[PDB]
Every structure is written in C-alpha cells, then in structure tokens.
Design a protein around this ligand. Structure first.
Ligand code: NA
Ligand code: NA
Ligand code: NA
Length: 111
C-alpha cells in the first residue's frame, strides 16, 4: 500500500524533499510535529497528486495544493495547534478508480 514517512529535516533547515509513487487508492503519509503558528508550504511536481493535511485543531482536512483557497498569499498555511500533523498524498477518486499511478516529488517546508 502507501508508505508512511516521518519527516526529518536536516538540522537547521526548514524543508525536506521526498519522492514516491502512488497506485490506485493508495496514499502516502508524511508525518511531523510542529508548533501552533508555524507555517507550512507544500509543493508537488505532479499536480495529479492531491496534498491534504490532517491534524489537531483542523476539522476534517485542509487542501495544501498550490491553488487552494486555504493558503495565504505566500502559499503558506498557519498551523492552528501544536502537535502531530499528517500530510497525505493521494490521487483523485477518478484516477484511483482507474488504478492509474502518480510518480511525484514533494517538497515540505515548515517554518
Ligand atoms: Na493514515
Ligand atoms: Na515547499
Ligand atoms: Na474524482
């Protein structure tokens, strides 16, 4: 199925890059711990791979993709609470139903 990765920044740096490939309904998860008010910016090379974030103080999830209305002018989202957050990378249901695949590179920035 999908893979579950703990995001681990190089010390003194505020981003990390991952690559993956999702098949069908699989989703990959990128987990991290952060403080209320830190800003997250996620960019992904394949816009056919959705990027949604789950965690404390977030009802349901938030779309972090580049055109999402949840983002501010700098493409950032402010974490509403401190704790463990989960970025999920997944295909649309349409593509998942067709057992399509998405190769992707994702850059996760947390400041
Ligand atoms: Na999960
Ligand atoms: Na980024
Ligand atoms: Na769909």
């Amino acid at each position: 199925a999908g893979k579950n990765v703990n995001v681990e920044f190089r010390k003194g740096h505020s981003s990390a890059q991952y690559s993956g490939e999702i098949k069908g309904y699989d989703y990959d998860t990128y987990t991290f711990y952060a403080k209320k008010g830190q800003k997250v910016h996620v960019s992904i090379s394949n816009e056919g791979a959705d990027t949604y974030m789950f965690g404390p103080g977030i009802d349901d999830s938030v779309d972090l993709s580049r055109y999402s209305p949840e983002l501010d002018s700098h493409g950032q989202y402010s974490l509403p609470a401190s704790g463990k957050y989960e970025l999920r990378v997944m295909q649309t249901r349409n593509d998942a139903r067709k057992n399509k695949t998405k190769k992707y590179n994702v850059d996760i920035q947390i400041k």
